[PDB]
Amino acid sequence: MSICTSEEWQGLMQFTLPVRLCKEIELFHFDIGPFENMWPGIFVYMVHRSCGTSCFELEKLCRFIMSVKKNYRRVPYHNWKHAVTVAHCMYAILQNNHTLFTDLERKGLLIACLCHDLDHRGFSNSYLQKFDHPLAALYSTSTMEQHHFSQTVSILQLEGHNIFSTLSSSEYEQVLEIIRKAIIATDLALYFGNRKQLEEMYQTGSLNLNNQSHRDRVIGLMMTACDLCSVTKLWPVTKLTANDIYAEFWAEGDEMKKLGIQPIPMMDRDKKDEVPQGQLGFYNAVAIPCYTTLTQILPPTEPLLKACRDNLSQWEKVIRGEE
Ligand SMILES: COc1cc2ncnc(N3CCOCC3)c2cc1OCCNc1nc2ccccc2s1
Ligand SMILES: [Mg+2]
Ligand SMILES: [Zn+2]
């Protein structure tokens, strides 16, 4: 477990957020990218606004973040930057649907978004299973996603890092099930079944938000909506984030080609030309259905569907030779 330092903690505790951002952060389309030095500060602020100021002991909270950052590897996409990106969309979702959720779910989900891809190796579940990796042996399904929760807990157990010190064991075991379910749900393999049922719930008007099974499903989707939110940004930010993604995908494809095995077209850098078409398929199969059903259940999240459709037209244009 990579532990943080004190001068990192002393610099972050004396962090104001510039007043121009105070308005900007609240918006769904907000792009954190240009404020790398402000991300630990931006997450502290987001936790502060959603769960209240005096919620976590700020010594611990600040300590928890910089070790979360240290336990993200340097890889093209699934990194510290990504985690904070995913955390902001959740902040925006939670802010615009506040009383729909509870202290422990808001505190739990924001942390879980920040922790949701901890120590990602730039490898998908297919790979790790296809080559009998240690992690795939210990976790048969949702392979990385279970390791992420395993890692999330390992950080909480560290010296003065347990930000849930002031929770009763009841609350503490409640909050770890919110986090675990949320982190497992980011496994896209599960989303498809999750979204299918939530649409059938929604269409035959029987979703009840204080029905406990529906909460975990609705929260399950929210994590997918947060994980995929590069598609909900402005067009240039999306084109740039798609590169970061494919650079991780093709990295994974190179390793296959060293082992003498054809990678899937998504992970072949020698199929760059199909990128325009491949995004279109993901947008129609995954993204649009994700944010349509979310907007249906939480109407204040409509700007996610809005911007998703904007970036669908852009990929539609790129295939139609008008980039
Ligand atoms: C915005 O994009 C993505 C975002 C993602 N965010 C999270 N998880 C993902 N995956 C889902 C897949 O298993 C690993 C995890 C994501 C996949 C994405 O790419 C869209 C798919 N691209 C394709 N490019 C090509 C190129 C040639 C032929 C076919 C295709 S399909
Ligand atoms: Mg993941
Ligand atoms: Zn993720």
Curated annotation (Swiss-Prot):
Where 3',5'-cyclic GMP binds, per the record, is at: 78, 279
Q: Which domain of life is it from?
A: Eukaryota
Q: Which residues bind a divalent metal cation 1?
A: 82, 116-117, 227
What does the tissue specificity note say?
Answer: Abundant in the putamen and caudate nucleus regions of brain and testis, moderately expressed in the thyroid gland, pituitary gland, thalamus and cerebellum.
Q: What residues does a divalent metal cation 2 bind to?
A: 117
* Protein's cellular compartments: Cytoplasm, Cytosol
Per UniProt, residues of the PDEase domain are 5-322
Locate the active site.
Answer: 78 (proton donor)
The UniProt record gives the binding positions of 3',5'-cyclic AMP as 78, 279
Job of this protein: Plays a role in signal transduction by regulating the intracellular concentration of cyclic nucleotides. Can hydrolyze both cAMP and cGMP, but has higher affinity for cAMP and is more efficient with cAMP as substrate. May play a critical role in regulating cAMP and cGMP levels in the striatum, a region of the brain that contributes to the control of movement and cognition.
Q: Which family does it belong to?
A: Belongs to the cyclic nucleotide phosphodiesterase family.
What is written about domains in the entry's comments? Answer: The tandem GAF domains bind cAMP, and regulate enzyme activity. The binding of cAMP stimulates enzyme activity.
Describe, as the record does, how this protein assembles with itself and its partners: Homodimer.
Q: Which disease is it linked to?
A: Dyskinesia, limb and orofacial, infantile-onset: An autosomal recessive, early-onset hyperkinetic movement disorder characterized by axial hypotonia, dyskinesia of the limbs and trunk, orofacial dyskinesia, drooling, and dysarthria. The severity of the hyperkinesis is variable. Striatal degeneration, autosomal dominant 2: An autosomal dominant disorder characterized by striatal degeneration and dysfunction of basal ganglia, resulting in hyperkinesis.
Q: What is this protein called?
A: cAMP and cAMP-inhibited cGMP 3',5'-cyclic phosphodiesterase 10A
Relative to the complete UniProt sequence, the shown stretch is 715 to 1036 of 1055
